[PDB]
Design an enzyme around this catalytic site. Sequence first.
Site: not given
Ligand SMILES: O=C1N/C(=N/c2ccccc2Cl)S/C1=C\c1ccc(O)c([N+](=O)[O-])c1
Length: 266
Positions: A9-11, A16, A82, A89, A128
Amino acid sequence: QYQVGPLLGSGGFGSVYSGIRVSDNLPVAIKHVEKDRISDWGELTRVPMEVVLLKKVSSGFSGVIRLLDWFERPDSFVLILERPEPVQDLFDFITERGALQEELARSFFWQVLEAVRHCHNCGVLHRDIKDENILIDLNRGELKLIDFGSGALLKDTVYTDFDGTRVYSPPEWIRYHRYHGRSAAVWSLGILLYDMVCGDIPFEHDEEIIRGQVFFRQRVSSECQHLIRWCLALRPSDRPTFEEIQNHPWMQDVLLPQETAEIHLH
Ligand SMILES: O=C1N/C(=N/c2ccccc2Cl)S/C1=C\c1ccc(O)c([N+](=O)[O-])c1
């Protein structure tokens, strides 16, 4: 150290990626945050508050995402987090399966409450809470709270800063740009629970939030409706406490996470 995989994901709060810890092939998530988009900093060295908050909630408790490590780059911070596998989600889960049964929603909401109670007990305010910020360990039926990038240290005075999700934000923020942590958190929980039982959020516009009239587009029990309307009280002081939510009759006889998976997730 880590073998990078695909983008998860991105945002606004960075990008991530999926990852593997080369040491033991442990599934991890690799989060990149640009330093220039980090308004809140702390310490325990100078790191973003997100790193600070994550280390405060770090425990054996599995309701909150675990920070395994972090790195500082010239223009970014890299979070190693983790990663349950398989995982999905709550947003995608509801998007593909629609409105949840009240038994499943009860189990999920309960797990979210226990996680936010954990954050508050550790001095952290998530700020959030929503379907997108909740992960589902599909095998263990366990829920995990993610993205602490808009969260702050919990306090009893007023918050004048907010950079979370607007449709989950309370009417006191919309009008006055002021809110207190716990009451505001309960509001987002009301929005979240509605989202679970109806398949979508109740409000989209500021005007709807100010008014706080809840319409149920789905068949929802009277006790669930009551809890939702209670969390979504216009006056923050008329909102229930976490204790009062978890003592609500609709929150009775919750399923264990493993039961929740065998019945609803398999
Ligand atoms: O602590 C966190 N903050 C996050 N933010 C985002 C949420 C969506 C897109 C981009 C980012 Cl950086 S993702 C995140 C943890 C994750 C950990 C494991 C995992 O599988 C995921 N995931 O699937 O998105 C997310």
